[PDB]
Ligand binder design. Structure first.
Ligand SMILES: Nc1nc2c(ncn2[C@@H]2O[C@H](COP(=O)(O)OP(=O)(O)OP(=O)(O)O)[C@@H](O)[C@H]2O)c(=O)[nH]1
Ligand SMILES: [Mg+2]
Lengths: 1107, 431, 87
């Protein structure tokens, strides 16, 4: 909109004269100025109003003769930054251009050192300024070594500078030699100077190539900004010198680009600028080959030269140039040649040179360029030749006329909209949309040119997923972009290398078939039925996906008129749907890397076929589909882990659709022959040693319908519960137990509720056994080599306890018992306070969903009013449970309730003493905020200490909860929470705590567990009485341990405790204890440490230990 | 002769690459002109790994610098060592990505991505056998954030049998006040997980705190951080440029240090800590270096190596220390009964010993471990990514270019799954 | 332990009437321990105690010790520094 940092900019420059000596301040200012200027790199035209004063505050500093060189360099840095931001072309029009600003600038530049790399910003800009002073309409002789000779020497010395200053020397000499008084004086000299440098220098050294590049740039700028009649005599010598250098063979891109830019300019000098020496015949010969270069920068530069040359030459040569450029599209070329040819054609059409005679040819090539994608390996190439085709089409709006384009508009408009929707690159889509808009605005003879732009504008061809299900249908709505649009998707995308292109195309065809059912059922389905026999792997998947999607669309369409699905598809096409499985089973295509893809495609095909109620029931095709599903659910470990969940969730869905469609004898019943075998085989498959077998069979058995569970529900439930039970053999079987609970939850949700029918649905006769299995898996805390995998088994154990509790609430809420509900609530509360973030978020979400459920309200909700007040509805979506900061402060408040105290504290102890740092830091702060409110009340503190001691006693000799609890106790004691219990001697609480700690530190070997014990033993010295003396003894037992690190840590902790609490040792003996704990190496041999230990014991009154 | 192609993108990426190249050139003994003038034969037995032997006995670098903005390009071209980089290995535009990830990866950075592939392919054609590409950029911005991801996604399709290593520089609010940084970091990490085998994280907050406290510098500028980054880079690539018993190539190192596919972010470090200007003050020993390599202060990330498990450990020593003296020290710190024993220095650690010492220092050490504490670097960005996503702030800019909420939620789910896996592996049985 | 100890001087900018103390604390000590020490000495709540360390090498500067799980060695607390306590 506008520049808003100017208020801060004028102050920055004001400090330029003060931060010129310091380095840190200068760097801060420079970095600051750069970050203030780079914000408007997209809006360079917004700084022009400020280009007046902003410059006066810079050049005015260097103009002052009473300033140091550091300030001059700092000002030139800002000047160069401003030039980079805005642009030298538009910024040098502001630089002084008087005859009295030339000798100043010259001496300024001559006071510089090319070796100083730090001041490179001063030499690059100064030269540019000189160019400005070269624009005065005065003679250099009037100013008076002469000025012209000095300028020529400076240019010659800078034109071979490896720094950026070389560029500044290009625009300089381009304006000094092209003058009236200096194009008859220095031009010939600089011409014999460039020829020598080009003939002597080589492209094998770094300095030889630098000089060559500089000379080429200087020559190209001179021939560009120079008189045509003046630089015409010297047009053959330079061309010969350039040809004798062999630049095309050199391995340099910039050199070739500059050579082409010079050749095109030299060619433009031979011809007169209108609305042909033999030398020109060579220039063209050096441009066409430029289109077949390896780099795109060379082709982009050669296209402009060719376009500029075809316009200064006759109409015979103009047509010959186009005819020669058209040869690049032969059958023996690569994509780079096609890209160069398209660029040349666009550059020629932009100026209006292509005649209608070349319409049959050009149009016969662009159609091949918009859909160019020739696989050149794992990925395909052609995105360059496609972007160029867009620009080529954009040029036809200015070249040909409506009368000359009407015969080909029917094919151009369709191709444009086809390439502006299903394209893979957003840039190509945007270019095609821009070309279509330009053609509609100029020609205006495109079918529905306005209606297509309003829906597919610049801000509409962005999301690729939206262009396949919104714009495609809108374009197919008309009868002019339907059959070709469908044929393109059928013969291009659905046979693409990427899989996202074979999924998006199928989804788009699904909707396209709704507007053209006849064409998709009589012309497209036969082509997708034969494409399945293609040996290509990407072709078979796409054809299967298309056959499934079109079939589903036809079924949905027929469902409207309650008409059968066979009305659109004939029986010949129907026989293909049956033989597709036999063809895949015979060739054995279910192997290798493509086997998983073929299985996934066939699964979706079978699912879409069963969801349409096809006439396949009672045929061998159903048996084949069932066998394939069983084999896929039988061999799961062979599939990669990157695509196992998809195959697991698709096979079960296909089986359910098949078992809920074909496998039925009458309404409310099913074929007993299949029911007596499928369930039996599955129950014989749920005891498979391989964990992946059960992981796939549990969900398959659970996804069965309700009519197929009548009478055999108890057996399925028993078989699923047998897997959820842990045993010595199934220790690390977490994925299997997860699927076991998922299948149970699915069965419960499907069967619903029905009293007086334990074998048909869930009722009060088996709800207790089901809840017992769900409540038992929550206590799983396995720690395998991978880590805490048990968490997974808990995830499915939470959702299974949610959807179930709601099911009864929507039918028979009286079945939910009070004890079971309270246990579930306490377990969810414990699971919503775990150090983990992803699992705690889901736990909190489930808790909120279960608490807010009031339709009808769920019975047996402990402290329902307090829970609702502590977790309002507004704090559900706004609070981020994944973040400990936005979770612990709200979860710690639950400790106030009696029920939510033991389990909540047990769950929070893991977070208050785990390994992560941020979680512990947040949990400690959240716990201190709550303890501050129950610090004065002795009853609350006593209850909290009792609950903590009970939790400690429960999880004894446990390395999952003992270490976290011991770590949290250290912080609890250091913060000063149990300050009321210190005013009484022989406190039972501190006695039982010390007793339990001695139990937990009994023979402790690991150093991680010993550190927490030592900390607790040193943070327990605060309690007076028998707990003070006895505890001290423990410290002594740790001062002569089996490791020196333990002794050192114990000594450090004792020294820290002696400084913390001063009332523990008298002042008369404190000095000796402090002096003995300082000049004593506790990491030495025990023979010398035992003496120090005995000395410390004799001073602290601790009885002498005994081995 | 295994060659490595080094690529630099973005302002910070180019500034780090220039300093790293200058450091490894001054350490190898290469004057800024191009010729060789060292005093050790060991500085040439592996120079071909990062330098092409052109005509005249010259050593041409292999640094491909790309930048949409014509700023750092001119600075590196006229630098102390700007004359070394090939002149057609510089690829730039005019307007950058304007701190938008959907600009330097879809509408703007994909306009020079084709010229980048041509340059990186023209540079690799001269090599006899390429090992793996390399990239140095910052997660903050659009040309560093989107261009790096675009190039990593485009090169993996044409060279799947090549290693992909990066040096992501996670930004920090203390160094930059830009608000569109969380999204650029999240979208960059989303692509740096499914198409990257190794990623060296160099958080900016860590270097800022180090310069604020350790170095006690007044106003830590970008140069202070770039110096430490280049020092760490030179200390990490010590085995790939000098001889030694531990001849661990790039693929072998990635296979031995990255057991999991998704988990591959390290916590690089380096000791002793120094600054610009003077350096010679105190000579450190092997015990002091070992005690300091494993300190969270010598790490270049805001993570506590002690708080978290230890997936893989590795260390590289540089100076007149012997692998026999190092083994004696690495076999007494993994023992409790041993004196001065440490609990955060794990077992089965990889260890190296170099001859050529760094610049301005006689003895140094580098640490390249992978601890679960790195999860803290992923959570700090998660929070800042959620609070701004609920209100849909600055989302119109992303939705207008072509992006959608689908990619945002996908990246969020990927980050959440990565954090969950890290937390799960943090609690694993030692034996 | 003598070489590991550091002599720190506790200042009182908010209460200039108090005298400057001097205590020898171990290098491997967490700021959580020093907070409790100050709370028990000056009788000030633990949460209402903002710590900071100013090196004599950096006069005119003050670093805040917000993290409690870190030791004094990580904050570059050398020997001869000053600790300014506030509340
Ligand atoms: N350490 C360090 N960080 C830097 C440096 N330059 C920029 N950054 C950080 O990187 C982010 C800015 O990204 P840049 O590299 O400047 O941007 P870019 O990649 O050129 O992208 P555009 O802004 O789109 O042009 C911020 O977080 C900066 O603090 C540098 O030299 N060193
Ligand atoms: Mg930039």
């Amino acid at each position: 909109e506008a520049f808003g940092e100017s208020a801060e900019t004028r102050a920055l420059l004001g400090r330029l004269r003060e931060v010129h000596g310091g380095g840190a301040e200068r760097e801060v200012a420079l970095e600051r100025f750069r970050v203030i200027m780079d914000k408007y790199q997209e809006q360079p035209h917004l700084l022009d109003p400020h280009l007046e004063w902003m410059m006066n505050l810079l050049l005015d500093i260097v103009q002052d003769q009473t300033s140091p060189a550091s300030l001059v360099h700092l000002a030139f840095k800002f000047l160069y930054i401003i030039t980079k931001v805005r642009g030298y072309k538009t910024f040098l029009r502001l630089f002084p251009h008087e005859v009295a600003d030339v000798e100043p600038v010259l001496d300024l530049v001559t006071i510089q050192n090319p070796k100083d790399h730090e001041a490179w910003e001063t030499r690059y800009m100064l030269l540019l300024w000189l160019s400005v002073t070269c624009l005065i309409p005065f003679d250099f002789s009037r100013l008076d070594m002469s000025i012209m000779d000095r300028i020529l020497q400076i240019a010659e010395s800078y034109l071979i500078v490896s720094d950026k200053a070389r560029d500044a020397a290009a625009v300089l000499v381009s304006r000094f030699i092209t003058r009236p008084d200096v194009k008859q004086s220095k031009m010939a000299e600089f011409l014999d100077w460039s020829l020598c440098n080009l003939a002597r220098s080589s492209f094998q050294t770094m300095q030889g190539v630098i000089t060559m590049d500089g000379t080429l740039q200087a020559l190209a700028q001179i021939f560009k900004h120079g008189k045509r009649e003046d630089c015409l005599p010297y047009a053959a010598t330079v061309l010969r010198c350039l040809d004798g250098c062999r630049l095309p063979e050199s391995n340099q891109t910039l050199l070739r680009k500059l050579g082409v830019k010079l050749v095109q300019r030299l060619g433009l000098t031979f011809l007169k600028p209108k609305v042909v020496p033999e030398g020109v015949e060579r220039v063209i010969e050096q441009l066409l080959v430029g289109l077949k270069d390896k780099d795109t920068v060379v082709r982009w530069s050669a296209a402009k030269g060719i376009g500029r040359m075809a316009g200064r030459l006759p109409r015979a040569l103009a047509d010959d140039v186009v005819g020669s450029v058209l040869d690049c599209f032969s059958f023996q070329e690569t994509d780079k040649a096609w890209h160069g040819g398209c660029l040349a054609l666009a550059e020629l059409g932009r100026r209006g040179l292509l005649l209608p005679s070349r319409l049959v040819d050009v149009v016969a090539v662009i159609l091949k360029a918009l859909t160019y994608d020739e696989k050149r390996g794992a990925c395909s190439v052609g995105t360059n030749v496609r972007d160029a085709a867009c620009y080529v089409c954009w040029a036809f709006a200015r070249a040909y006329e409506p009368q000359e384009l009407k015969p080909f508009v029917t094919a151009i408009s369709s191709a444009l909209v086809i390439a502006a929707v299903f394209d893979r690159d957003i840039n190509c889509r945007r270019a095609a949309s821009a070309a279509f808009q330009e053609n509609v605005g100029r020609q205006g003879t495109f079918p529905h040119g306005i209606d297509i732009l309003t829906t597919a504008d610049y801000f509409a061809v962005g999301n690729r997923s939206n262009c396949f299900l919104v714009i495609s249908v809108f374009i197919a709505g008309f009868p002019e972009y339907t059959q070709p649009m469908i044929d393109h998707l059928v013969t291009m995308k659905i046979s693409h290398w990427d899989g996202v292109i074979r999924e998006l195309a199928a989804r788009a065809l699904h909707n396209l078939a709704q507007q053209a059912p006849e064409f998709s059922a009589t012309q497209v389905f036969p082509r997708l039925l034969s494409m399945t026999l293609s040996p290509d792997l990407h072709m078979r998947h796409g054809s299967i996906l298309a056959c499934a999607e079109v079939a589903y669309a036809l079924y949905k369409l027929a469902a409207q008129e309650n008409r059968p699905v066979t009305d659109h598809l004939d029986e010949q096409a129907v026989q293909g749907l049956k033989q597709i499985h036999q063809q895949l089973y015979d060739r054995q295509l279910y192997r290798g890397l493509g086997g998983q893809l073929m299985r996934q495609a066939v699964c979706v095909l079978i699912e879409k076929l069963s969801l349409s109620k096809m006439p396949f029931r009672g045929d061998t095709v159903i048996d084949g589909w069932q066998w394939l599903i069983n084999d896929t659910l039988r061999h799961l470990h062979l599939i990669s882990s990157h695509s196992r969940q998809q195959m697991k969730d698709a096979a079960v869905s296909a089986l359910a659709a098949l078992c809920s469609e074909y496998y039925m004898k009458e309404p409310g019943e099913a074929d007993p022959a299949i029911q007596e075998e499928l369930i039996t085989q599955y129950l014989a498959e749920l005891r498979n040693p391989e964990e992946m077998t059960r992981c796939g069979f549990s969900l398959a058995l659970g996804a069965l319908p309700g009519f197929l569970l009548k009478g055999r529900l108890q057996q399925v439930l028993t078989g699923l519960r047998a897997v959820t039970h842990t045993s010595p053999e199934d220790v690390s079987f977490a994925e299997s137990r997860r699927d076991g609970l998922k299948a149970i939850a699915r069965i419960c949700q499907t069967v619903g509720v029905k009293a007086g029918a334990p074998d048909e649905a869930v009722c009060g006769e088996n709800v207790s056994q089901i809840y017992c299995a769900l409540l038992g898996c929550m206590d799983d805390y396995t720690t395998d080599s991978r880590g805490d995998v048990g968490t997974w088994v808990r995830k499915a154990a939470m959702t299974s306890l949610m959807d179930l509790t709601l099911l009864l609430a929507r039918s028979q809420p009286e079945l939910i018992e009070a004890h079971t509900c309270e246990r579930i609530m306490c377990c969810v509360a414990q699971q919503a306070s775990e150090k983990i973030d992803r699992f705690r978020a889901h736990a909190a979400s489930v808790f909120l969903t279960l608490l807010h459920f009031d339709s009808p309200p769920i019975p047996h909700v402990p402290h329902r009013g307090e829970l609702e007040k502590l977790f309002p509805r507004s704090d559900v979506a706004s609070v981020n449970w994944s973040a400990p900061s936005q979770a612990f402060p709200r979860i710690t408040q639950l400790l106030g309730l009696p029920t939510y105290r033991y389990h909540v504290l047990l769950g929070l102890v893991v977070s208050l003493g785990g390994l992560t740092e941020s979680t512990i830091r947040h949990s400690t702060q959240s716990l201190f905020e709550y303890m501050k409110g129950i610090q004065s009340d002795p009853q609350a503190l006593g209850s909290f200490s009792g609950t903590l001691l009970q939790i400690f006693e429960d999880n004894l000799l446990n390395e999952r909860v003992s270490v976290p609890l011991l770590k949290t106790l250290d912080h609890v004691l250091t913060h000063g929470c149990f300050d009321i219990f210190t005013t009484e001697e022989d406190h039972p609480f501190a006695v039982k705590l010390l007793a339990l700690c001695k139990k937990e530190i009994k023979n402790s070997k690991d150093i991680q567990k010993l550190l927490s014990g030592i900390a607790v033993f040193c943070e327990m010295v605060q309690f007076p009485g028998d707990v003070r003396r006895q505890a001290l003894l423990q410290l002594c037992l740790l001062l002569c341990h089996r490791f020196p690190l333990i002794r050192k840590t114990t000594a450090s902790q004792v020294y820290e405790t002696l400084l913390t609490y001063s009332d523990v040792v008298g002042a008369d003996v404190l000095d000796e204890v402090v002096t003995v704990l300082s000049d004593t190496a506790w990491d030495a041999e025990l023979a010398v440490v035992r003496e120090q230990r005995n000395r410390l014991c004799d001073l602290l009154g601790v009885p002498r230990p005994q081995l | 002769m295994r060659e490595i192609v080094h690529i630099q993108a973005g302002q910070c990426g180019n500034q780090i690459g220039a300093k790293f190249w200058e450091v490894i050139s001054d350490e190898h003994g290469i004057d800024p002109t191009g010729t060789y003038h060292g005093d050790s034969d060991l500085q040439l037995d592996r120079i071909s790994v990062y330098y092409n032997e052109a005509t005249g006995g010259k050593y041409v670098p292999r640094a491909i610098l790309v930048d949409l903005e014509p700023g750092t390009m001119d600075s590196v071209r006229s630098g102390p060592f700007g004359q070394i980089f090939r002149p057609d290995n510089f690829v730039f535009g005019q307007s950058g990505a304007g701190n938008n990830w959907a600009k330097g990866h879809y509408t703007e950075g994909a306009e020079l991505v084709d010229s980048v592939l041509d340059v990186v392919r023209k540079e690799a054609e001269s090599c006899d056998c390429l090992q793996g590409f390399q990239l140095t950029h910052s997660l903050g911005g659009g040309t560093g954030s989107g261009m790096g991801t675009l190039l990593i996604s485009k090169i993996r399709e044409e060279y799947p049998d090549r290693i992909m290593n990066t040096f992501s520089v996670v930004p920090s609010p203390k160094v930059s006040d830009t608000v569109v940084e969380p999204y650029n970091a999240t979208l960059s990490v989303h692509q740096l997980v499914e198409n990257t085998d190794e990623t060296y994280c160099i958080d900016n907050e860590a270097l800022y705190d180090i310069c604020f406290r350790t170095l006690k510098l007044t106003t830590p500028t970008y140069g202070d951080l770039n110096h430490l980054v280049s020092a760490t880079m030179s200390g990490v690539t010590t085995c790939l440029r000098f001889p030694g018993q531990l001849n661990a190539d790039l693929r072998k190192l990635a296979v031995n240090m990255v057991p999991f596919p998704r988990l591959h972010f390290f916590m690089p470090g380096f000791a002793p800590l120094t600054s610009r200007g003077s350096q010679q003050y105190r000579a450190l020993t092997v015990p002091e270096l070992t005690q300091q390599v494993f300190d969270a202060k010598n790490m270049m990330a805001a993570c506590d190596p002690r708080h978290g498990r230890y997936l893989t450990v590795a260390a590289v020593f540089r100076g007149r220390m012997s692998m026999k003296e190092v083994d004696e020290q690495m076999l007494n710190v993994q023992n409790k009964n041993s004196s001065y024993f440490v609990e955060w220095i794990p077992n089965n650690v990889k260890t190296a010993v170099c001859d050529i010492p760094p610049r301005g220092l006689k003895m140094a050490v580098t640490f390249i471990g992978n601890s679960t504490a790195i999860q803290e670097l992923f959570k700090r960005i998660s929070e800042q990514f959620t609070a701004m996503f609920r209100r849909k702030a600055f989302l119109h800019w992303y939705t207008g270019e072509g992006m959608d909420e689908m990619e945002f939620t996908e990246a969020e789910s990927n980050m959440n799954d990565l954090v969950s896996e890290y937390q799960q592996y943090q609690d694993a049985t030692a034996e | 332990l003598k070489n590991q100890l550091l002599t720190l001087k506790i200042k009182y900018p908010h209460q200039l009437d108090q005298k400057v103390l001097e205590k020898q604390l171990p290098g491997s000590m967490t700021i959580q321990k020093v907070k409790g020490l100050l709370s028990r000495l000056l009788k000030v709540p633990v949460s209402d105690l903002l710590l900071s360390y100013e090196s004599p090498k950096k006069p005119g500067r003050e670093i805040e010790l917000e993290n409690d799980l870190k030791s004094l060695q990580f904050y570059s607390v050398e020997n001869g520094d000053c600790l300014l306590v506030r509340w």
